[PDB]
Design an enzyme around this catalytic site. Structure first.
Site, PDB file in Angstrom:
ATOM      1  N   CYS B 109      24.399  10.623  -9.612  1.00  0.00           N
ATOM      2  CA  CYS B 109      23.854  11.477  -8.583  1.00  0.00           C
ATOM      3  C   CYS B 109      22.395  11.199  -8.266  1.00  0.00           C
ATOM      4  O   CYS B 109      21.506  11.411  -9.104  1.00  0.00           O
ATOM      5  CB  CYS B 109      23.984  12.946  -8.969  1.00  0.00           C
ATOM      6  SG  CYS B 109      23.397  14.051  -7.698  1.00  0.00           S
ATOM      7  N   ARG B 112      19.374  14.494  -7.864  1.00  0.00           N
ATOM      8  CA  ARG B 112      19.074  15.315  -9.051  1.00  0.00           C
ATOM      9  C   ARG B 112      17.666  15.945  -9.092  1.00  0.00           C
ATOM     10  O   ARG B 112      17.376  16.767  -9.965  1.00  0.00           O
ATOM     11  CB  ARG B 112      19.380  14.548 -10.334  1.00  0.00           C
ATOM     12  CG  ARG B 112      20.895  14.484 -10.682  1.00  0.00           C
ATOM     13  CD  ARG B 112      21.037  13.651 -11.894  1.00  0.00           C
ATOM     14  NE  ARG B 112      20.998  12.192 -11.647  1.00  0.00           N
ATOM     15  CZ  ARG B 112      20.847  11.273 -12.611  1.00  0.00           C
ATOM     16  NH1 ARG B 112      20.684  11.665 -13.887  1.00  0.00           N
ATOM     17  NH2 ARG B 112      20.869   9.955 -12.326  1.00  0.00           N
ATOM     18  N   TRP B 281      24.373  19.048  -0.476  1.00  0.00           N
ATOM     19  CA  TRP B 281      24.367  18.597   0.918  1.00  0.00           C
ATOM     20  C   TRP B 281      24.464  17.078   0.913  1.00  0.00           C
ATOM     21  O   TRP B 281      24.213  16.439  -0.120  1.00  0.00           O
ATOM     22  CB  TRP B 281      23.131  19.106   1.690  1.00  0.00           C
ATOM     23  CG  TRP B 281      21.809  18.761   1.088  1.00  0.00           C
ATOM     24  CD1 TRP B 281      21.143  17.533   1.140  1.00  0.00           C
ATOM     25  CD2 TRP B 281      20.947  19.651   0.342  1.00  0.00           C
ATOM     26  NE1 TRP B 281      19.939  17.625   0.451  1.00  0.00           N
ATOM     27  CE2 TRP B 281      19.784  18.907  -0.027  1.00  0.00           C
ATOM     28  CE3 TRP B 281      21.053  20.993  -0.066  1.00  0.00           C
ATOM     29  CZ2 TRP B 281      18.743  19.467  -0.800  1.00  0.00           C
ATOM     30  CZ3 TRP B 281      20.008  21.554  -0.839  1.00  0.00           C
ATOM     31  CH2 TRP B 281      18.862  20.794  -1.177  1.00  0.00           C
ATOM     32  N   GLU B 286      26.551   8.498   3.007  1.00  0.00           N
ATOM     33  CA  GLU B 286      27.905   8.774   2.480  1.00  0.00           C
ATOM     34  C   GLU B 286      28.862   8.909   3.666  1.00  0.00           C
ATOM     35  O   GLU B 286      30.042   8.495   3.584  1.00  0.00           O
ATOM     36  CB  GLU B 286      27.943  10.084   1.712  1.00  0.00           C
ATOM     37  CG  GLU B 286      27.149  10.096   0.452  1.00  0.00           C
ATOM     38  CD  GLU B 286      27.130  11.505  -0.126  1.00  0.00           C
ATOM     39  OE1 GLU B 286      28.107  11.878  -0.834  1.00  0.00           O
ATOM     40  OE2 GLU B 286      26.147  12.230   0.158  1.00  0.00           O
TER      41      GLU B 286
HETATM   42  C1  HEM Z   1      21.596  18.669  -3.381  1.00  0.00           C
HETATM   43  C2  HEM Z   1      22.082  17.632  -2.665  1.00  0.00           C
HETATM   44  C3  HEM Z   1      22.803  16.430  -3.300  1.00  0.00           C
HETATM   45  C4  HEM Z   1      22.773  15.169  -2.859  1.00  0.00           C
HETATM   46  C5  HEM Z   1      21.988  14.678  -1.631  1.00  0.00           C
HETATM   47  C6  HEM Z   1      23.619  14.381  -3.749  1.00  0.00           C
HETATM   48  C7  HEM Z   1      23.860  13.038  -3.634  1.00  0.00           C
HETATM   49  C8  HEM Z   1      24.926  12.429  -4.254  1.00  0.00           C
HETATM   50  C9  HEM Z   1      25.511  11.172  -3.844  1.00  0.00           C
HETATM   51  C10 HEM Z   1      25.016  10.364  -2.613  1.00  0.00           C
HETATM   52  C11 HEM Z   1      26.500  10.893  -4.714  1.00  0.00           C
HETATM   53  C12 HEM Z   1      27.471   9.669  -4.712  1.00  0.00           C
HETATM   54  C13 HEM Z   1      28.764  10.094  -3.995  1.00  0.00           C
HETATM   55  C14 HEM Z   1      29.633   8.939  -3.498  1.00  0.00           C
HETATM   56  O1  HEM Z   1      29.185   7.760  -3.442  1.00  0.00           O
HETATM   57  O2  HEM Z   1      30.824   9.207  -3.153  1.00  0.00           O
HETATM   58  C15 HEM Z   1      26.557  11.957  -5.695  1.00  0.00           C
HETATM   59  C16 HEM Z   1      27.403  12.030  -6.786  1.00  0.00           C
HETATM   60  C17 HEM Z   1      27.488  13.047  -7.704  1.00  0.00           C
HETATM   61  N1  HEM Z   1      26.752  14.262  -7.703  1.00  0.00           N
HETATM   62 FE1  HEM Z   1      25.305  14.695  -6.340  1.00  0.00          FE
HETATM   63  N2  HEM Z   1      24.064  15.188  -4.778  1.00  0.00           N
HETATM   64  C18 HEM Z   1      23.645  16.482  -4.490  1.00  0.00           C
HETATM   65  C19 HEM Z   1      23.944  17.635  -5.189  1.00  0.00           C
HETATM   66  C20 HEM Z   1      24.805  17.675  -6.279  1.00  0.00           C
HETATM   67  C21 HEM Z   1      25.226  18.872  -7.008  1.00  0.00           C
HETATM   68  C22 HEM Z   1      24.902  20.350  -6.647  1.00  0.00           C
HETATM   69  C23 HEM Z   1      25.965  18.480  -8.070  1.00  0.00           C
HETATM   70  C24 HEM Z   1      26.662  19.314  -9.174  1.00  0.00           C
HETATM   71  C25 HEM Z   1      26.118  20.487  -9.590  1.00  0.00           C
HETATM   72  C26 HEM Z   1      26.024  17.039  -8.033  1.00  0.00           C
HETATM   73  C27 HEM Z   1      26.682  16.292  -8.960  1.00  0.00           C
HETATM   74  C28 HEM Z   1      27.186  15.052  -8.718  1.00  0.00           C
HETATM   75  C29 HEM Z   1      28.167  14.334  -9.536  1.00  0.00           C
HETATM   76  C30 HEM Z   1      28.859  14.805 -10.828  1.00  0.00           C
HETATM   77  C31 HEM Z   1      28.372  13.003  -8.847  1.00  0.00           C
HETATM   78  C32 HEM Z   1      29.320  11.865  -9.289  1.00  0.00           C
HETATM   79  C33 HEM Z   1      30.685  12.046  -8.637  1.00  0.00           C
HETATM   80  C34 HEM Z   1      31.719  11.073  -9.196  1.00  0.00           C
HETATM   81  O3  HEM Z   1      31.467  10.291 -10.177  1.00  0.00           O
HETATM   82  O4  HEM Z   1      32.849  11.120  -8.632  1.00  0.00           O
HETATM   83  N3  HEM Z   1      25.247  16.555  -6.980  1.00  0.00           N
HETATM   84  N4  HEM Z   1      25.545  12.845  -5.440  1.00  0.00           N
HETATM   85  C1  LIG Z   2      38.325   7.319  -9.100  1.00  0.00           C
HETATM   86  C2  LIG Z   2      36.982   8.001  -8.979  1.00  0.00           C
HETATM   87  C3  LIG Z   2      36.250   8.355 -10.109  1.00  0.00           C
HETATM   88  C4  LIG Z   2      34.999   8.989  -9.955  1.00  0.00           C
HETATM   89  N1  LIG Z   2      34.269   9.352 -11.032  1.00  0.00           N
HETATM   90  N2  LIG Z   2      34.512   9.257  -8.720  1.00  0.00           N
HETATM   91  C5  LIG Z   2      35.225   8.910  -7.612  1.00  0.00           C
HETATM   92  C6  LIG Z   2      34.653   9.181  -6.248  1.00  0.00           C
HETATM   93  C7  LIG Z   2      34.851  10.622  -5.813  1.00  0.00           C
HETATM   94  C8  LIG Z   2      33.888  10.785  -4.641  1.00  0.00           C
HETATM   95  C9  LIG Z   2      32.859  11.832  -4.994  1.00  0.00           C
HETATM   96  C10 LIG Z   2      32.191  12.387  -3.744  1.00  0.00           C
HETATM   97  C11 LIG Z   2      30.880  13.025  -4.169  1.00  0.00           C
HETATM   98  C12 LIG Z   2      30.289  13.606  -2.899  1.00  0.00           C
HETATM   99  C13 LIG Z   2      29.113  14.561  -3.048  1.00  0.00           C
HETATM  100  C14 LIG Z   2      29.090  15.711  -3.866  1.00  0.00           C
HETATM  101  C15 LIG Z   2      27.940  16.521  -3.840  1.00  0.00           C
HETATM  102  C16 LIG Z   2      27.817  17.781  -4.676  1.00  0.00           C
HETATM  103  C17 LIG Z   2      26.886  16.173  -2.999  1.00  0.00           C
HETATM  104  C18 LIG Z   2      26.974  15.028  -2.206  1.00  0.00           C
HETATM  105  N3  LIG Z   2      25.960  14.635  -1.400  1.00  0.00           N
HETATM  106  N4  LIG Z   2      28.059  14.257  -2.269  1.00  0.00           N
HETATM  107  C19 LIG Z   2      36.466   8.277  -7.721  1.00  0.00           C
END
Ligand code: HEM
Ligand SMILES: Cc1cc(N)nc(CCCCCCCc2cc(C)cc(N)n2)c1
Ligand code: HEM
Ligand SMILES: Cc1cc(N)nc(CCCCCCCc2cc(C)cc(N)n2)c1
Ligand SMILES: C[C@H](O)[C@H](O)[C@H]1CNc2nc(N)[nH]c(=O)c2N1
Ligand SMILES: C[C@H](O)[C@H](O)[C@H]1CNc2nc(N)[nH]c(=O)c2N1
Ligand SMILES: [Zn+2]
Lengths: 403, 405
Positions: B109, B112, B281, B286
């Site tokens: 993320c 953070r 947000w 993305e």
């Molecule tokens: C506040 C605005 C936020 C922004 C701009 C942001 C940005 C992002 C982005 C760009 C990704 C990669 C997603 C992708 O490539 O599909 C991501 C992943 C992630 N974020 Fe954030 N994030 C935000 C808030 C949050 C919040 C509130 C949480 C949880 C409390 C969070 C937890 C996570 C987690 C666990 C991932 C990994 C998802 C995965 O492995 O599938 N983020 N974030």
């Molecule tokens: C197979 C697989 C495993 C894994 N860990 N993660 C994925 C991708 C799932 C996509 C996660 C989308 C996260 C989107 C998001 C979530 C939040 C909270 C904020 C923000 N800007 N974007 C696939």
């Protein structure tokens, strides 16, 4: 044990079994991954690396187990036992240089790996001779714009003495003059080598694109200065297909990317000077060399010329200027008829390379962070490809600067 | 220097050492022989108690009452409960701390810097799918806040000894349908073909558009999942237009405001919250790069390039790069016009650099996954490309969990 490797765009899966052939540890442990780090922090052992390499060589020519194979293992053993070292035959050297390239995890141009001209320069005994061989390399590799991949291999490291070294990191480098007010004129990547050259007697210019002399070092001697004849260094003036003012920036880059500070390791032997060259991928020049803030840093200048809204990141002014600069590089190399490859074409060929190596060897070591281009990552197929990174030998290796 | 990994920024020349990684209690996929950092998914009793003690120590450190009487009573309290029930329960403030810490800990993320600002809704009283739906709608209303988005998580009851899990079947609270066609192409989002088909098997009447919002499949312990349609007024969407290219609006593209992940497991002190949807947000890449331009997603690059009159017959015109930039700009412009919170990849990566500095001082490091942090366009134009990163698993954590079906 054997990692599963998935492509997320196509859903296809392979298993890397090649990684089992790694004998050298990288920086990662189960506790933490260090894969984004740029640098890592006796006879019996030479003999095993030597043997394994000779086995590699006889296997490649399909003569595994033959008379020739057995006798050659005996020569290597006899030589090491008597002298603590050995020497490669020219054909083995050729095979090992290609394999080192093939094995290089950070190289996206490996589809070409079997096509490498190898100049044997192991009969070199002076910095003067090094210079002549380097000029012959440049001339050969450049080929009036139709670039051909090449390596020149100077004498191996020996227990007694200092190394043969080329001090410059590439055969072609632009000076970086540190200014009174702390800025840099020219390429900030080359400040240190520019000061070395001057300190060893070079008369510096004061341009943004002054080609550096080579500092060449024969064992246990001070390095010597050698000016490349301007006619041997092919350069490309940068212009843009549709933006007329762009040529007015006075930007240019050299045709030949030739790495000169890496160690080549073949069968336990080390070649501390073995410069090698291919052709550029346009993003190396257009994105990194010209747009890095710690390189030529021309983004802003280009954006103002394009009249972009520079006040805010969300106008995507950086992205738009970078695209045009990359375009200008491709255009100009095409116009000058000098080999170049764009990041789309290069990554597509790398994907074909992965598939070739899967069939040939059961895997391919690749460093995802270096393979994926510095603009438009996910627009290239390599972004969606998982990759396994490990060290195979023969290998190109980083080595500390000689000073 | 020190016996911890040295971490360098190649733009600025500056160096730190990550000491935080010593706190990692769980192995990732890499070994000395080979790095697997690029893989997306690599493959209790006494175990529970040790995880619980660690989490309670973490809680008491964060409130600076480490070694205190309240600290020692809580530990005793936790083992007593585990001793007699095989499990234990978190206090409200323990849950709030662990949820924020799971976010702070998430190496993938980039957002953070916001970790301390998370609204934690406690839904551990939930006992039906209908009530899950209410809680989810409330979450959506709070988080959306008419375009002024607010980070939030809603936490449903934890996993319990051989009683079924609460699960949200959908991977996000908002997903567009993906309809498999008779010729094998997909109408809508190909990412969502499986969950779309699952929704229809469970009684959903399908639409036939490219942007049909899916219903939610919500599962309460030991029941088949139940289907719930989101009231359209709750799902804020943004029609896409371009600031200067007047034809872009005619393409009929749009995206939703609220990125809300619903299929991840939140683990705190050994307790497992199988349904704990969280939302923030978007970063514009993305939507504009991945969701719209991935060849295996909406795949619109060629269409946009044709509208822009680009030479799509040769790689070296950079038609892909030009189209992708304009699509990203449309995303930014449209969200700004609609007054819906969004962050571009320049401002996001810059804020992530500030995050790294804050965490260096606060904890001695920051677990980060370079391949995920670096944006999918213009990578080296952002400061994170030049920054080395150490990746390691800390707990509390969000973890991927197998699909319930
Ligand atoms: C506040 C605005 C936020 C922004 C701009 C942001 C940005 C992002 C982005 C760009 C990704 C990669 C997603 C992708 O490539 O599909 C991501 C992943 C992630 N974020 Fe954030 N994030 C935000 C808030 C949050 C919040 C509130 C949480 C949880 C409390 C969070 C937890 C996570 C987690 C666990 C991932 C990994 C998802 C995965 O492995 O599938 N983020 N974030
Ligand atoms: C197979 C697989 C495993 C894994 N860990 N993660 C994925 C991708 C799932 C996509 C996660 C989308 C996260 C989107 C998001 C979530 C939040 C909270 C904020 C923000 N800007 N974007 C696939
Ligand atoms: C034929 C055309 C070639 C192309 C298009 C190409 C492409 C590239 C690119 C883009 C990089 C990354 C450079 C950077 O980011 O600074 C690279 C690195 C590298 N290439 Fe190639 N390559 C080619 C030929 C070669 C040859 C002939 C060799 C050696 C025989 C070679 C060995 C290497 C090595 C060892 C690296 C990593 C260097 C380091 O770690 O500093 N490549 N290649
Ligand atoms: C500290 C450090 C370590 C390391 N391994 N590498 C570097 C710098 C890498 C510079 C390599 C640039 C030359 C790349 C190249 C070489 C060749 C042969 C073809 C081509 N297109 N590009 C620095
Ligand atoms: C910190 C990070 O590992 C470093 O900036 C790498 C990223 N990827 C790269 N990729 C290539 N091809 N060349 C580079 O110099 C770098 N730099
Ligand atoms: C194979 C590779 O790990 C995969 O495509 C990753 C790369 N980086 C990513 N980065 C982010 N933020 N999101 C992703 O889905 C991916 N995908
Ligand atoms: Zn690793």
């Amino acid at each position: 044990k054997f990692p599963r490797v998935k492509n997320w765009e196509l859903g296809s899966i392979t298993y890397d079994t090649l990684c089992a052939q790694s004998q050298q540890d990288g920086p990662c442990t189960p506790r933490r991954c260090l894969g984004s780090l740029v640098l890592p922090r006796p006879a019996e052992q030479l003999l095993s690396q030597a043997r394994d390499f000779i086995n590699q060589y006889y296997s490649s020519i399909k003569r595994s187990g033959s008379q020739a194979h057995e006798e050659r293992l005996q020569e290597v053993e006899a030589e090491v036992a008597s002298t603590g070292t050995y020497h490669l035959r020219e054909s083995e050297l050729v095979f090992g240089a290609k394999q080192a390239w093939r094995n290089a995890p950070r190289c996206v141009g490996r589809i070409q790996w079997g096509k490498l001209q190898v100049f044997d320069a192991r009969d070199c005994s002076s910095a003067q001779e090094m210079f002549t061989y380097i000029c012959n390399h440049i001339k050969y590799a450049t080929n009036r714009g139709n670039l051909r991949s090449a390596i020149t291999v100077f004498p191996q490291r020996a227990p007694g003495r200092g190394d043969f070294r080329i001090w410059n990191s590439q055969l072609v480098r632009y000076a970086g003059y540190r200014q009174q007010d702390g800025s840099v004129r020219g390429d900030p990547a080359n400040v240190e080598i520019t000061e070395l050259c001057i300190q060893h007697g070079w008369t510096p210019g004061n341009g943004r694109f002054d080609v550096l002399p080579l500092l060449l070092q024969a064992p246990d001697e001070a390095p010597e200065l050698f000016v490349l004849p301007p006619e041997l260094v092919l350069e490309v003036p940068l212009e843009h297909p549709t933006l007329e003012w762009f040529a007015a920036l006075g930007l240019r880059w050299y045709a030949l990317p030739a790495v000169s500070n890496m160690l080549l390791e073949i069968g336990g032997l080390e070649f501390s000077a073995a410069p090698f060259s291919g052709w550029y991928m346009s993003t190396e020049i257009g994105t990194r060399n010209l747009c890095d803030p710690h390189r030529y840093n021309i983004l802003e200048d280009v954006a103002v010329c394009m009249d972009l809204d520079t006040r805010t990141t969300s106008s995507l002014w950086k992205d738009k200027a970078a695209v045009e600069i990359n375009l200008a590089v491709l255009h100009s190399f095409q116009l000058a008829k000098v080999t170049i490859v764009d990041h789309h074409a290069a990554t597509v060929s790398f994907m074909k390379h992965l598939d070739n190596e899967q069939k040939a060897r059961g895997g391919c070591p690749a460093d995802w962070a270096w393979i994926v281009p510095p603009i438009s990552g996910s627009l290239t197929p390599v972004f969606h490809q998982e990759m396994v990174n490990y060290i195979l030998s023969p290998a190109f290796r980083y080595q500390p600067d000689p000073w």
